[PDB]
Symmetry: D2
């Protein structure tokens, strides 16, 4: 139990923010791991 | 068309982040407007 | 170490989605617990 | 004005949800456009 799930979200504004996020989170699995690591490094520089 | 929607999210980690968010976004409608305005002020102080 | 944090987000679209979310998540602490429980119940009805 | 921004988020749980999201949203720019389009198609199948 960890595959696709259904998220009931009320309100267009709310749905859109999460929908774009669902795409960002889901797509993060389709981005080459080595390329994500590099980004994490650029981000590791400063969380500010 | 702006009521509750269904968001298919794959991966437990992904689902949990959005699920907690769905709750935060949805609940934001149940928090007294005047009280949210006050918070926005405290937040308006600095986005840093 | 769990108070306010700084999140560096690149891209306006990205910043806005998270900013509105920061407000939703942060405000969730300002909404009466008993009132949130009631919502969670309405949400507990179905995650679909 | 649309580059990196700073998001002040209070509470570890809150910060973590948005932080992982900041990474997902930001990384979405590093994932080949043609590959994202394919995903969007798989997602276009059903929003349920």
């Amino acid at each position: 139990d960890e595959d696709t799930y259904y998220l009931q979200v009320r309100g267009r504004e709310n749905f859109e923010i999460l929908m774009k996020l669902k795409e960002s989170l889901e797509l993060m699995e389709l981005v080459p791991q080595p390329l994500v690591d590099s980004y994490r490094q650029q981000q590791q520089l400063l969380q500010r």
